Design a protein around this ligand. Sequence first.
Ligand code: 7RN
Length: 164
Amino acid sequence: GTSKLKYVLQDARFFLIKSNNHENVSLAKAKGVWSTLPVNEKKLNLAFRSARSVILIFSVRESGKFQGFARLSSESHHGGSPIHWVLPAGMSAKMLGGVFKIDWICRRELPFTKSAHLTNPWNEHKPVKIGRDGQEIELECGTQLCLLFPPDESIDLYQVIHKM
Ligand SMILES: CNC(=O)c1cc(-c2ccc(C)s2)[nH]n1
């Protein structure tokens, strides 16, 4: 069912995360971590302190899909185990240095064709698939987007609820 999912999403904040490649999303799904540009890292750290759940909704550029969504379980931290991200053309790993811990809520994909009816007020009411990396998604749009994903029966949200 969807009741624990709705509980986790209650009063949450939502951010669109754009990866240039599948490799980084696969690494994030395997290791429970994410890193972003410093401009976005500052926004996510502020959001983590301000809301009961901060949700990252992932999309690999040019894939036409979202690849899942996850909840921040920490602010960003440096000096942990290194993560072998595939780095965009220009600038090095010092940029992607802050590491957030995340708990996956859904590792299933959702094609953009299924979210065409959702627009994001914080991006000019453009379709929610449209947005830069780090674009915040308004509460109602983000909740409905997450509820469109196929259920991920491998996930138990009991442990996430306890972290709140
Ligand atoms: C592990 N993190 C990543 O792959 C990643 C890459 C980005 C980028 C946003 C805008 C770019 C030119 S690059 N934001 N996050």
